[PDB]
Structure formats: C-alpha cells, structure tokens
A paper describes a structure:
Among them, the ubiquitin-like protein Atg8 (called LC3/GABARAP proteins in humans) plays a central role. In this study, we found that in both S. pombe and Saccharomyces cerevisiae, Atg8 physically interacts with Hfl1, a vacuole membrane protein. This interaction promotes the localization of Atg8 at the vacuole membrane in a lipidation-independent manner. hfl1Δ and atg8Δ caused the same vacuole-related phenotypes, which are not shared by other atg mutants. The structures showed that the Atg8-Hfl1 interaction is mediated by noncanonical mechanisms—using Hfl1 sequences adopting helical conformation (termed helical AIMs here) and in the case of budding yeast, involving a previously unreported binding site on Atg8.
To understand the atomic details of the SpHfl1-SpAtg8 interaction, we solved the crystal structure of SpAtg8 complexed with SpHfl1(386-409) at 2.2 Å resolution. The structure of SpAtg8 is similar to other Atg8-family proteins, consisting of a ubiquitin fold and two α-helices attached at the N-terminus. The structure of SpAtg8 can be superimposed on that of ScAtg8 with an rms difference of 0.8 Å for main-chain atoms except for those of terminal tails. As a result, the two AIM-binding hydrophobic pockets (W-site and L-site) on SpAtg8 resemble those on ScAtg8 and other Atg8 homologs. SpHfl1(386-409) is comprised of an extended coil followed by an α-helix, and interacts with the W-site, the L-site, as well as α3 of SpAtg8, burying ~2000 Å2 of surface area (detailed interactions are summarized in Figure 3—figure supplement 3A). SpHfl1(386-409) forms little interaction with crystallographically adjacent SpAtg8 molecules, suggesting that the complex structure is not markedly affected by crystal packing. Strikingly, SpHfl1(386-409) neither forms an intermolecular β-sheet with β2 of Atg8 (middle), nor uses two hydrophobic residues separated by two residues to engage the W-site and the L-site. Instead, SpHfl1(386-409) uses Phe388 at the coil and Tyr398 at the helix for binding to the W-site and the L-site, respectively, with as many as nine residues between them. In addition, a hydrophobic interaction is formed between Leu386 of SpHfl1 and a hydrophobic pocket near the W-site, some electrostatic interactions are formed between the side-chains of Asp391 and Glu395 of SpHfl1 and Lys46 and Arg28 of SpAtg8, respectively, and two hydrogen bonds are formed between the main-chain of SpHfl1 and the side-chain of SpAtg8. Alanine-substitution of SpHfl1 Phe388 (F388A) and Tyr398 (Y398A), which bind to the W-site and the L-site in SpAtg8, resulted in ~4 fold and ~1000 fold decrease in the affinity with SpAtg8, respectively. This result suggests that binding to the L-site is much more important than that to the W-site for the SpHfl1-SpAtg8 interaction, which is in contrast to the interactions between canonical AIMs and Atg8 where the W-site binding is usually more important than the L-site binding.
Author numbering:
A (entry chain A): 2 to 113
B (entry chain B): 386 to 407
Write the structure that this text describes.
C-alpha cells in the first residue's frame, strides 16, 4: 500500500489532484514511491508534475538522473503491478491508470 | 499539500524530451 494514501484522506487527495489538473492541464500528477523490500536508492521527492507529451522511457531517464543511478544498474518501474511499455505516452498511461483520487501511482524497484 | 513546479526538475524534462529511444 502507498504511504501517501495513508497520510492523507481521499478528500484531501482529490482536492489536490483536481486543483493541480486545473492549474497545469499539460502536467501529470505522479506519486512515485520505492518498493518496500527493495535494495536500491530512495530519494526525498515523490511528488512529480511530469509533462503529458513525455514517454515512459523518457520519464525513466528523468528519475535515473534524479536519483543518480549508476549506468550499469537496472531500474524497474511498475504501474498497478505491471511494467508499462517504454514507448507509451504519459497521457495515455494516465487516462488508463489514474487512481480514483486523480493521481497516478508509480512504484519502482531495483530487482524484478 | 505542497504540489508545486520544481525548478530542479524542469531542465531534466527538457533534456528528456530530446532523448528518444526504442
């Protein structure tokens, strides 16, 4: 389960996602947390506003640069416990996978 | 609840937009 969902009730989350989407219609509100029992690095930022025209692969690149992962290591990103295709658009992914509160929940692991 | 545009991220986004893969 997500920590963000445990920290804030549905009302707060829905209000926030609606406000975000109304203020930045070109951006996608993403919550990105580390797999609980994984090994690799975890950072401070989990709240992202990533451009809708970005692909999944480009986003993966972005977070690799953010966490400063070593170029030899893998990083597997899960959405609803499945691995999304790298060539897929973030807008498509969002329309298909957005949560009831209007956020897109993303998990990542070093091993999978 | 602290959801704002990060200036520490925008350059990365603009960098990634040019970085196409397969």
């Amino acid at each position: 389960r997500s920590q963000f969902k445990d920290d804030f009730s549905f009302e707060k989350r829905k209000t926030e996602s609606q406000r975000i989407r109304e203020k930045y219609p070109d951006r996608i509100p993403v919550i990105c947390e580390k797999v609980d029992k994984s090994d690799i690095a975890a950072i401070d930022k989990k709240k992202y506003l990533v451009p809708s025209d970005l692909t999944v692969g480009q986003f993966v690149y972005v977070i690799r640069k953010r966490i400063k992962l070593s170029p030899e290591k893998a990083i597997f990103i899960f959405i609803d416990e499945i691995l999304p295709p790298t060539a897929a658009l973030m807008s498509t992914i969002y329309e298909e996978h957005k949560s009831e509160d209007g956020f897109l929940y993303i998990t990542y692991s070093g091993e999978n | 609840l602290q959801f704002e545009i990060d200036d520490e991220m925008e350059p990365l986004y603009n960098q990634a937009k040019q970085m196409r893969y397969g």
